């Protein structure tokens, strides 16, 4: 089952079009769920239930104004 309920996320900076399955298709101003980090390409997962790899170049730190 679910391990953690409170982790981290990434806010897409540039709209990316997954060239293949291995890749994930995201848009700008989007927030996916980071699964694998500290690696060449991160593995995010859309709300649709899809998971792919993308460049961290477009990735960016996601933070909120009021949320401890």
Label each residue of the chain as H, E or C: CCCCCCCCCEECCCCECCCCCCECCECCCCEEEEEECCCCEEEEECCCCCEEEEECCCCCECCCCCCC
Q: Which of 59, 12, 68 is nearest to 40 (CA)?
A: 59
Deposited experimental method: NMR
Where are the chain's structural domains?
1-68
Structure tokens at 61: 């730190």
Find all residues with CB under 8 Å of 14, minimum gap 6, and list them.
28, 58
Domain 1-68: CATH superfamily is: SH3 Domains (2.30.30.40)
């Amino acid at each position: 089952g679910s391990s953690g309920s409170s982790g981290k996320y990434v806010k897409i900076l540039y709209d990316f079009t997954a060239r293949n399955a291995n890749e994930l298709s995201v848009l700008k101003d989007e927030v996916l769920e980071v699964l694998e980090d500290g690696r060449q390409w991160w593995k995010l997962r859309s709300r649709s239930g899809q998971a792919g790899y993308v460049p961290c170049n477009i990735l960016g730190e996601a933070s909120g104004p009021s949320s401890g």
